[PDB]
Design an enzyme around this catalytic site. Structure first.
Site, PDB file in Angstrom:
ATOM      1  N   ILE C  12     109.416  -6.216  12.829  1.00  0.00           N
ATOM      2  CA  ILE C  12     110.330  -7.310  13.088  1.00  0.00           C
ATOM      3  C   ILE C  12     109.551  -8.605  13.336  1.00  0.00           C
ATOM      4  O   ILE C  12     109.923  -9.666  12.833  1.00  0.00           O
ATOM      5  CB  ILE C  12     111.278  -6.969  14.265  1.00  0.00           C
ATOM      6  CG1 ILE C  12     112.096  -5.721  13.933  1.00  0.00           C
ATOM      7  CG2 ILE C  12     112.217  -8.146  14.593  1.00  0.00           C
ATOM      8  CD1 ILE C  12     112.821  -5.780  12.612  1.00  0.00           C
ATOM      9  N   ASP C  33      99.866 -10.437  20.286  1.00  0.00           N
ATOM     10  CA  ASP C  33      99.796  -8.984  20.092  1.00  0.00           C
ATOM     11  C   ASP C  33      98.411  -8.480  20.507  1.00  0.00           C
ATOM     12  O   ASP C  33      97.414  -8.885  19.914  1.00  0.00           O
ATOM     13  CB  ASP C  33     100.085  -8.608  18.633  1.00  0.00           C
ATOM     14  CG  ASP C  33     100.540  -7.160  18.479  1.00  0.00           C
ATOM     15  OD1 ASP C  33      99.883  -6.255  19.016  1.00  0.00           O
ATOM     16  OD2 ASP C  33     101.564  -6.925  17.821  1.00  0.00           O
ATOM     17  N   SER C 120     114.658  -8.564  20.759  1.00  0.00           N
ATOM     18  CA  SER C 120     114.979  -8.128  19.403  1.00  0.00           C
ATOM     19  C   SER C 120     115.438  -6.676  19.425  1.00  0.00           C
ATOM     20  O   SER C 120     115.181  -5.929  18.485  1.00  0.00           O
ATOM     21  CB  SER C 120     113.765  -8.282  18.482  1.00  0.00           C
ATOM     22  OG  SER C 120     112.915  -7.144  18.554  1.00  0.00           O
ATOM     23  N   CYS C 151     119.934  -3.613  14.803  1.00  0.00           N
ATOM     24  CA  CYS C 151     120.282  -3.726  13.387  1.00  0.00           C
ATOM     25  C   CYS C 151     121.655  -3.110  13.128  1.00  0.00           C
ATOM     26  O   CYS C 151     122.523  -3.724  12.494  1.00  0.00           O
ATOM     27  CB  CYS C 151     119.222  -3.016  12.533  1.00  0.00           C
ATOM     28  SG  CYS C 151     118.661  -1.403  13.196  1.00  0.00           S
ATOM     29  N   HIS C 178     119.621   6.410   8.973  1.00  0.00           N
ATOM     30  CA  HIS C 178     118.691   5.355   9.281  1.00  0.00           C
ATOM     31  C   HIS C 178     117.333   5.572   8.634  1.00  0.00           C
ATOM     32  O   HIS C 178     116.806   6.686   8.619  1.00  0.00           O
ATOM     33  CB  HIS C 178     118.539   5.200  10.801  1.00  0.00           C
ATOM     34  CG  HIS C 178     118.155   3.816  11.219  1.00  0.00           C
ATOM     35  ND1 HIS C 178     116.865   3.337  11.107  1.00  0.00           N
ATOM     36  CD2 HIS C 178     118.894   2.797  11.717  1.00  0.00           C
ATOM     37  CE1 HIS C 178     116.825   2.085  11.530  1.00  0.00           C
ATOM     38  NE2 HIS C 178     118.042   1.735  11.907  1.00  0.00           N
ATOM     39  N   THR C 181     111.336   4.434  11.447  1.00  0.00           N
ATOM     40  CA  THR C 181     110.875   3.372  12.352  1.00  0.00           C
ATOM     41  C   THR C 181     109.571   3.747  13.037  1.00  0.00           C
ATOM     42  O   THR C 181     109.130   4.894  12.973  1.00  0.00           O
ATOM     43  CB  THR C 181     111.942   2.981  13.407  1.00  0.00           C
ATOM     44  OG1 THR C 181     112.466   4.150  14.043  1.00  0.00           O
ATOM     45  CG2 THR C 181     113.091   2.199  12.746  1.00  0.00           C
TER      46      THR C 181
HETATM   47  N1  LIG Z   1     112.404  -1.834  12.650  1.00  0.00           N
HETATM   48  C1  LIG Z   1     113.721  -1.914  12.725  1.00  0.00           C
HETATM   49  O1  LIG Z   1     114.520  -1.296  11.752  1.00  0.00           O
HETATM   50  C2  LIG Z   1     114.348  -2.679  13.856  1.00  0.00           C
HETATM   51  C3  LIG Z   1     115.587  -3.288  13.681  1.00  0.00           C
HETATM   52  C4  LIG Z   1     116.166  -3.972  14.743  1.00  0.00           C
HETATM   53  C5  LIG Z   1     115.520  -4.048  15.973  1.00  0.00           C
HETATM   54  N2  LIG Z   1     114.298  -3.446  16.133  1.00  0.00           N
HETATM   55  C6  LIG Z   1     113.635  -3.530  17.452  1.00  0.00           C
HETATM   56  O2  LIG Z   1     112.575  -4.484  17.500  1.00  0.00           O
HETATM   57  C7  LIG Z   1     111.559  -4.014  18.379  1.00  0.00           C
HETATM   58  C8  LIG Z   1     110.245  -3.865  17.625  1.00  0.00           C
HETATM   59  O3  LIG Z   1     110.415  -2.920  16.581  1.00  0.00           O
HETATM   60  P1  LIG Z   1     109.400  -2.786  15.345  1.00  0.00           P
HETATM   61  O4  LIG Z   1     110.111  -2.013  14.306  1.00  0.00           O
HETATM   62  O5  LIG Z   1     108.833  -4.113  15.015  1.00  0.00           O
HETATM   63  O6  LIG Z   1     108.235  -1.869  15.973  1.00  0.00           O
HETATM   64  P2  LIG Z   1     106.648  -2.050  15.718  1.00  0.00           P
HETATM   65  O7  LIG Z   1     105.957  -0.938  16.392  1.00  0.00           O
HETATM   66  O8  LIG Z   1     106.319  -2.165  14.280  1.00  0.00           O
HETATM   67  O9  LIG Z   1     106.225  -3.411  16.467  1.00  0.00           O
HETATM   68  C9  LIG Z   1     105.917  -3.452  17.842  1.00  0.00           C
HETATM   69  C10 LIG Z   1     104.737  -4.391  18.011  1.00  0.00           C
HETATM   70  O10 LIG Z   1     104.638  -4.790  19.359  1.00  0.00           O
HETATM   71  C11 LIG Z   1     103.280  -4.761  19.744  1.00  0.00           C
HETATM   72  N3  LIG Z   1     103.118  -4.594  21.203  1.00  0.00           N
HETATM   73  C12 LIG Z   1     103.114  -3.438  21.939  1.00  0.00           C
HETATM   74  N4  LIG Z   1     102.921  -3.753  23.242  1.00  0.00           N
HETATM   75  C13 LIG Z   1     102.798  -5.094  23.345  1.00  0.00           C
HETATM   76  C14 LIG Z   1     102.595  -5.935  24.433  1.00  0.00           C
HETATM   77  N5  LIG Z   1     102.194  -5.424  25.594  1.00  0.00           N
HETATM   78  N6  LIG Z   1     102.519  -7.300  24.220  1.00  0.00           N
HETATM   79  C15 LIG Z   1     102.641  -7.818  22.940  1.00  0.00           C
HETATM   80  N7  LIG Z   1     102.838  -6.975  21.863  1.00  0.00           N
HETATM   81  C16 LIG Z   1     102.919  -5.634  22.068  1.00  0.00           C
HETATM   82  C17 LIG Z   1     102.634  -3.653  18.910  1.00  0.00           C
HETATM   83  O11 LIG Z   1     101.249  -3.851  18.721  1.00  0.00           O
HETATM   84  C18 LIG Z   1     103.417  -3.728  17.615  1.00  0.00           C
HETATM   85  O12 LIG Z   1     102.755  -4.500  16.631  1.00  0.00           O
HETATM   86  C19 LIG Z   1     112.012  -2.656  18.912  1.00  0.00           C
HETATM   87  O13 LIG Z   1     112.551  -2.801  20.205  1.00  0.00           O
HETATM   88  C20 LIG Z   1     113.053  -2.196  17.907  1.00  0.00           C
HETATM   89  O14 LIG Z   1     114.034  -1.316  18.433  1.00  0.00           O
HETATM   90  C21 LIG Z   1     113.710  -2.763  15.091  1.00  0.00           C
HETATM   91  N1  LIG Z   2     105.938   0.825  18.435  1.00  0.00           N
HETATM   92  C1  LIG Z   2     107.230   1.387  18.851  1.00  0.00           C
HETATM   93  C2  LIG Z   2     108.253   0.258  18.940  1.00  0.00           C
HETATM   94  C3  LIG Z   2     109.636   0.731  18.503  1.00  0.00           C
HETATM   95  C4  LIG Z   2     109.953   0.786  17.152  1.00  0.00           C
HETATM   96  C5  LIG Z   2     111.215   1.215  16.751  1.00  0.00           C
HETATM   97  C6  LIG Z   2     112.163   1.594  17.701  1.00  0.00           C
HETATM   98  S1  LIG Z   2     113.775   2.125  17.187  1.00  0.00           S
HETATM   99  O1  LIG Z   2     114.369   0.953  16.669  1.00  0.00           O
HETATM  100  O2  LIG Z   2     113.614   3.258  16.370  1.00  0.00           O
HETATM  101  F1  LIG Z   2     114.562   2.608  18.433  1.00  0.00           F
HETATM  102  C7  LIG Z   2     111.844   1.534  19.060  1.00  0.00           C
HETATM  103  C8  LIG Z   2     110.581   1.105  19.461  1.00  0.00           C
END
Ligand SMILES: NC(=O)c1ccc[n+]([C@@H]2O[C@H](COP(=O)([O-])OP(=O)(O)OC[C@H]3O[C@@H](n4cnc5c(N)ncnc54)[C@H](O)[C@@H]3O)[C@@H](O)[C@H]2O)c1
Ligand SMILES: NCCc1ccc(S(=O)(=O)F)cc1
Ligand SMILES: NC(=O)c1ccc[n+]([C@@H]2O[C@H](COP(=O)([O-])OP(=O)(O)OC[C@H]3O[C@@H](n4cnc5c(N)ncnc54)[C@H](O)[C@@H]3O)[C@@H](O)[C@H]2O)c1
Ligand SMILES: NC(=O)c1ccc[n+]([C@@H]2O[C@H](COP(=O)([O-])OP(=O)(O)OC[C@H]3O[C@@H](n4cnc5c(N)ncnc54)[C@H](O)[C@@H]3O)[C@@H](O)[C@H]2O)c1
Ligand SMILES: NC(=O)c1ccc[n+]([C@@H]2O[C@H](COP(=O)([O-])OP(=O)(O)OC[C@H]3O[C@@H](n4cnc5c(N)ncnc54)[C@H](O)[C@@H]3O)[C@@H](O)[C@H]2O)c1
Ligand SMILES: NCCc1ccc(S(=O)(=O)F)cc1
Ligand SMILES: NCCc1ccc(S(=O)(=O)F)cc1
Lengths: 334, 334, 334, 334
Positions: C12, C33, C120, C151, C178, C181
């Site tokens: 995201i 990050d 997010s 989402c 889904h 993730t």
């Molecule tokens: N991927 C999806 O389909 C989707 C859709 C909607 C919402 N989200 C939400 O968005 C959020 C992120 O999801 P994602 O898919 O990007 O996961 P992701 O693991 O790809 O991204 C998480 C990022 O946060 C970083 N991180 C971890 N701890 C940290 C900290 N202490 N300080 C700064 N950065 C840190 C990690 O290095 C990583 O790059 C989640 O809460 C998820 O539920 C995801």
């Molecule tokens: N790196 C893990 C971050 C993360 C990535 C995805 C999700 S979820 O959207 O599947 F609930 C939750 C947390």
């Protein structure tokens, strides 16, 4: 303005159609595919699971394929001699069905009025193979039927030419890890015609060994290397993009950096558009819809010693190849 | 005792064979499949991408399939009329080709000498449908051609039965997330006959919507539920194991725990072997080679309120269904 | 003009950055990050396995990230209170780590000097939730920390709003199939902190049941539907694109054509760019890089009767949502 | 009879445990893993996405892992000095965390009372490496800490031994197409330590180049081949089973059939249980749960000439290697 016909509106047929849409010098005027009605044909062209949607409105009216103002003729003929190519003034027929890979068979397009033919695959017989950037200038205008080789050969030939021209290839064995192809089955089953049993095993969960004359075909386009190359393939559950791994022994010894540099100046110079070069930590998905035939991966391959190398090159087996078919179509017409 | 024939040695046919191997009350005596040499057929039986290697020696001599110390006859007819089941003394033919799903087409097995036929799929006509545990006892021995329904019907029906018996289903809508099947394509292509366009889309990379009559079919084996259930499916890149999500509205109110318990007692009582129950945190692969028709996942479902529920049940669409075909074959003979 | 900062440069994080590059009205001035050096961060931004290479050159210099005539500050701090958002003049912080989903945690960003914060993800506390097209106009500048929901909620909420407005929803249950993730695991292993054991199961070969509050969360952004919706999820081996499968009972009776036309009105009028409408034979790959929250699939769903419907909607969980975050960020600043 | 201790209850830890369950000559008396509660530990042992359900009831009580009736002690320590291996009468600890790969780190088990230790991976120092069938008889009991090498080394080393023993390997380069492992990520992300960026790229949709020391490691177990072998790897979306592809020049000339015959003779005699041979048209799934280290695929390879060969061998990287750990344990105890 080369007038192209497509027989077999499949992975290559459709992506050849697509690449021509951005080319001024070549236009598709006719399609044949009997396993697909016009409404169905329009759907498969509009939507693509790999390369995205068609960059244009795709419609049909009055039995034509409409791409905006361009009406494209559509036929549904199993017998390729009954396709009225000459009626649409077809210059070249892209033969992309995979079942007319012989001069005798491909020549049925000629009887329908097409001037010339390109097999979108290596021939089963002794049909002239041409690889753009390697031996295409040797094409003679009276050669009416030719092959554009395989995707794998289009990848290995440029690499091999560069390595050979500079350092001299003594001998080489190739492995390709190849993306999924339409001759494969979604679940365990009998391969078409009872040949290549492994190919009918589940595509989704298997590494699948496969024979390939692609490495050996490099000796056809580059005669110097006749008898010096062969290889095998392994199929893997990947949408597109494949990779060649060439283990070769060389005459004049070199450092890996010198090998890489030579490849880089070919990519930047005389083989621009055919051969690429990168030093990034790339993976296969990074080459989706890349139109080069071969992209050398510097950091992936290595050298055992001064004369024994492993050389790694990438290729989108659908898209790179489809572009070359256009390149050849134009060349053999012009 | 029961002498089984198999028309179409595909996913179901080969697993019907495998399951029958483990049974004493039933043996396979004949096989027909014209898209398969004997050598090829042995190979496809010997190795399986999903269910591992056949647990016995698989050889062939004299045009016979040998499984340890038993000869099995092998035929290669495209016309079911031409298969000599009578000489082999077949009691039931397992019609697992996918292309003889009417009484007119399936009756040519009876011409070939077979006593009765089980369609390994829903019929395209009004051929009688039977699901073991639900309505198989209503089988009439005069009925020589029957259907064992779909795998999805065999999963849903025992669930709907128990729920309807105790609480009464007012109305239900079903989704099945379904594993990959042989009607699908590895890369984007035209589906057979130009029907079901979406199913020709790349199996490896897509969630693919699909129509299913399996929920309407529950109304045929449980007439009380006629007009009260329907649904859809989504194909996914999974080798085997599918899952049903039944969203139903009930007349008698209940807590989710009460509904769960009712299913537990059915599963451990009258529907043991057909319907299963689990409270573990399971995923699809946990049910690979599970012979049950339906395995209710307690923790996966929930209730919005006392009359509105989502009920989740798993099924190995290959193996569970294949065992049922044997159970039904034995029943209609015995 | 709107100055965005990003915390957690993941799926995201990076795609918000990407969407923002196409937008003039919002710019990304800072990133944090701690698991990702500047070199590593540039690699992850240049190359994407699902969405392709970044639409321009990506380099870094002097600790900044260069994207043309632009420089983005990069930090690597685990504590959000120690990130200097203030010195960058950050209007909004995209909180996309996954682990600062309460006001008390997220207010660390305010101590860093940022003006406002969008989580997010759905919050674990009473933090206000907004969905663009649904309740975003109800926001007022007062509240410095908000959530853009999930989402799934951004998919469901527009569909449910339109159906509820026109026909009235009595009750609803939802399954979402889904895409994979980053909380999932490649091989079977222990889920993070023992929560959600199933998510720790092999992602490549499994249908994985999962809990979601996304349907229940619709009742926050749409108070009217409080207590009326909930559901579950099934995770599958798909890169991106997810589908919502809504079973619901309506107050006013209706035919499926009337339902479809209402959704089509909304998608072409007031919910343009948020809610979409298709009648084509689409599969998941057709929605990769589709920027809408919800794309209704007419032919995928159906009605059992005048008051009971299955409604099917697609969403690119990554790209659709990443654009909504930006819409919200602009709105809370303007 | 040989009592085994497991540090790290992951893919290798749990499969070593399972591999021991059947066997009479070895037994697991204690397990240690801090990032896993006992209940969670029982869940992961009971269910497996690749190898099926544990063939026995698994429960816990009083902090003991109960298998059928047998009580297994379970600990949750970060310092192996504190794990009471001595109290449990442990002869060998299987060190399978991946983070105690030096003498200094691994020797904490010896102070815990473990009599000996086997690293379930290549060491970060000069810890003696062993591969069963190859150099295991050169082990002496003074060595308390040893390594079982990698799965890839165990595949290659047997094949390298036989070929070198009869023909003499001048030089060799190896590719392995390798199944997915725990260090990979489900979606694009940062690899741990910032090391090997490619491994953090989406595991489901990519061919991912990887370094491997496993070909250079063959020089340690076979000093004769030191400096003559190296190679690379490609990770692909496969659950288990990998394949080695060895290209090499031979000193003494030979036909492929002679080379193949030599491997067969070793597989049937001195290297039985370790090296396997087949002329069947196998795919990766055919070796799931195969306990051999290396299964030579005769038809998958070929020769360029009398001195230049491509040799192909399969291995269940999980199951074969797991059984080799036990073999090594039994050997170093007796
Ligand atoms: N991927 C999806 O389909 C989707 C859709 C909607 C919402 N989200 C939400 O968005 C959020 C992120 O999801 P994602 O898919 O990007 O996961 P992701 O693991 O790809 O991204 C998480 C990022 O946060 C970083 N991180 C971890 N701890 C940290 C900290 N202490 N300080 C700064 N950065 C840190 C990690 O290095 C990583 O790059 C989640 O809460 C998820 O539920 C995801
Ligand atoms: N790196 C893990 C971050 C993360 C990535 C995805 C999700 S979820 O959207 O599947 F609930 C939750 C947390
Ligand atoms: N896809 C690749 O990776 C790739 C790369 C290089 C070369 N090729 C070659 O190109 C050829 C086509 O490959 P593809 O991948 O596009 O396969 P494909 O299955 O997708 O396409 C074949 C098409 O031809 C049609 N067809 C079959 N018989 C026909 C006939 N009698 N007349 C007209 N049309 C007919 C089919 O309907 C189908 O759409 C093959 O020879 C293949 O080896 C493929
Ligand atoms: N696979 C499942 O999960 C599942 C479950 C329940 C029922 N079914 C049904 O079982 C039937 C078979 O499906 P499948 O999955 O085994 O497909 P499949 O492709 O694996 O099997 C079909 C087999 O029939 C053979 N065949 C085709 N035409 C024939 C003919 N003229 N005469 C003899 N053999 C012929 C083919 O060679 C092939 O081996 C279908 O109707 C399917 O819907 C499938
Ligand atoms: N599976 C294979 O293909 C394969 C083959 C050969 C060798 N190996 C090697 O085996 C080793 C283990 O790999 P794996 O595949 O089992 O990975 P894994 O992630 O599945 O297992 C590691 C386990 O160790 C535990 N752990 C982590 N830190 C610990 C600590 N400090 N104390 C106690 N337990 C701890 C984790 O909870 C986890 O269960 C690695 O060194 C790997 O290189 C793997
Ligand atoms: N319809 C399938 C035609 C086809 C498609 C692809 C190939 S190959 O390029 O993988 F050899 C071969 C044949
Ligand atoms: N050979 C294709 C036969 C076939 C036809 C239909 C199916 S189905 O179970 O998806 F309906 C499976 C296999």
């Amino acid at each position: 303005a080369t007038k192209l016909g497509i027989n077999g509106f499949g992975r290559i047929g459709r992506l050849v159609f697509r690449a021509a849409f951005g080319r001024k010098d070549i236009e598709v005027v006719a399609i044949n595919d009997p396993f697909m009605d016009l409404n169905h044909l329009c759907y498969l062209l509009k939507y693509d699971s790999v390369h995205g949607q068609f960059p244009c409105e795709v419609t049909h009216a009055d039995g034509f394929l409409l791409i905006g103002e361009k009406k494209v003729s559509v036929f549904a003929e199993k017998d390729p001699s009954q396709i009225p190519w000459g009626k649409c003034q077809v210059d070249v027929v892209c033969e992309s069905t995979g079942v007319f890979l012989t001069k005798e068979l491909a020549s049925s397009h000629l009887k329908g009025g097409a001037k010339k033919v390109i097999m979108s695959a290596p021939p089963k017989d002794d049909t002239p193979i041409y690889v753009m950037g390697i031996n295409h200038h040797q094409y003679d205008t009276k050669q009416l039927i030719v092959s554009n080789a395989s995707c794998t050969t289009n990848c290995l030939a440029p690499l091999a030419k560069v390595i050979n021209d500079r350092f001299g290839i003594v001998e080489g064995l190739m492995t390709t890890v190849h993306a999924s192809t339409a001759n494969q089955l979604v679940v365990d089953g009998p391969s078409k015609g009872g040949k290549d049993w492994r190919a009918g095993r589940c595509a989704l969960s298997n590494i699948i060994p496969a024979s390939t004359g692609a490495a050996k075909a490099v000796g056809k386009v580059l005669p110097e290397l006749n008898g010096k190359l062969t290889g095998v393939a392994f199929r893997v559950p990947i949408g597109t993009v494949s990779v060649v791994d060439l283990v070769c022994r060389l005459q004049k010894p070199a450092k890996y950096e010198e090998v890489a540099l030579e490849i880089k100046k070919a990519a930047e110079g005389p083989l621009k558009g055919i051969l690429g070069y990168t030093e990034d930590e790339v993976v296969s998905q990074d080459f989706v819809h890349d139109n080069r035939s071969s992209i050398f991966d510097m950091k992936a391959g290595l050298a055992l010693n001064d004369n024994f190398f492993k050389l790694v090159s990438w290729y989108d087996n659908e898209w790179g190849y489809s572009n070359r078919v256009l390149d050849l179509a134009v060349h053999i017409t012009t």
